[PDB]
């Protein structure tokens, strides 16, 4: 029993209320949990730690508005030569340093923190459909330990409705990447 929505068709119309498939709460708001790394795999730019695989699950997808979804992922970036690269969260001088977070698609190329870089487009399907990618911290040198925690938040650029390219980016929840750096 597909035992989703509230009781109406979308009985609120703020904004851009297209969305081909209306994103699992297990997705929307989801804690991808990177867990403890060592400090050995991040001491030097483009150190990273063994990575793990997070997915986005869209259910009931319409083929009709959008045969494809990308995303695009925003956070604040750690510096100016890593606007690919998260800042981390909370204590700025308490958490790791030379870390934050990425996100990559599922080809394993690093997408770019603007919220507007698509990524691997996903030919949807009618019904139920999970695009995967990866994510792991990247060292921009040599890493310390603490805490490394980051809240992006990520789009759903919809697209494949007719004409040729037909595109719709809304908004698509939060990641809240959660985790920490130990000394080994």
Same mark, same amino acid.
């Given at each position: 029993?597909?035992? @989703?929505?509230?009781?109406?068709? *979308? ?11 209306? *994103? ?12 403890? *790394? %060592? @400090? ?60 934050? *977070?990425?996100?990559?698609? %599922? ?23 999970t695009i995967p990618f990866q994510a792991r911290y990247f060292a921009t040198g040599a890493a310390t330990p603490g805490a490394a ?19 719709? @980016? ?15």
């Amino acid at each position: 029993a597909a035992t @989703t929505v509230n009781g109406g068709t *979308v009985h609120f119309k703020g904004e851009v209320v297209n969305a081909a498939c209306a *994103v699992d709460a297990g997705s929307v708001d989801q804690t991808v949990q990177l867990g403890q *790394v %060592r @400090t050995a795999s991040l001491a030097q730019e483009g150190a990273t730690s063994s990575a793990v695989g997070f997915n986005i699950q869209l259910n009931d997808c319409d083929t009709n508005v959008a045969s494809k979804a990308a995303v695009a992922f925003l956070g604040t970036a750690i510096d100016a030569g890593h606007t690919n690269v998260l800042a981390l969260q909370s204590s700025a001088a308490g958490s790791a340093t030379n870390v934050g *977070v990425q996100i990559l698609d %599922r080809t394993g190329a690093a997408l770019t923190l603007d919220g507007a870089t698509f990524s691997s487009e996903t030919t949807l399907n009618n019904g139920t459909n999970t695009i995967p990618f990866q994510a792991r911290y990247f060292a921009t040198g040599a890493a310390t330990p603490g805490a490394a925690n980051a809240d992006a938040t990520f789009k759903v650029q919809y697209q494949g409705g007719g004409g040729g390219g037909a595109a719709t @980016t809304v908004n698509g929840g939060t990641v809240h990447f959660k985790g920490e750096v130990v000394n080994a």
